[PDB]
Design a protein around this ligand. Structure first.
Ligand SMILES: CCCc1ccc(S(N)(=O)=O)cc1
Length: 126
């Protein structure tokens, strides 16, 4: 069901949460070889989450679940803000700009610790 597909997408999101926090620790410790691998892992995880979210949105639209569509449209937009910041963080790493990496990292935590409520609402709407 769309609801179980969202829980699957939810767990995939939690996987990025865990990998991000161990990446943050590695960055602080200066373990750039670890950071690089974690950033690659995160890119895969964020791509996967987005693909699952698109499928769920398309399914809610086919189902005519107007409230779920509204929430998912808002959530997908928020996801994209996160992704743009993530990609900027990756570029900061390639460039060796630790000051921008720190900024982008802290912005991305704010984007995710703000969209949490909406993510929980969607579970209850589908
Ligand atoms: C690239 C990060 C995109 C992103 C992932 C997860 C959430 S949350 N805490 O489920 O609202 C928001 C943005």
């Amino acid at each position: 069901s769309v609801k179980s597909e969202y829980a699957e997408a939810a767990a995939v999101g939690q996987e990025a949460v865990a990998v991000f926090n161990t990446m943050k620790a590695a960055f602080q410790n200066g373990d750039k070889e670890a950071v690089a691998q974690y950033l690659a892992r995160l890119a895969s995880l964020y791509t996967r989450h987005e693909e699952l979210l698109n499928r769920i949105l398309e399914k809610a639209r086919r189902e005519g679940n107007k409230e779920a569509v509204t929430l998912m449209n808002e959530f997908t937009a928020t996801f994209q803000t996160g992704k743009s910041i993530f990609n900027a963080m990756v570029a900061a790493f390639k460039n060796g700009d630790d000051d921008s990496f720190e900024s982008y990292l802290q912005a991305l935590e704010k984007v995710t610790a703000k969209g949490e409520t909406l993510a929980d609402q969607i579970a209850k709407a589908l």
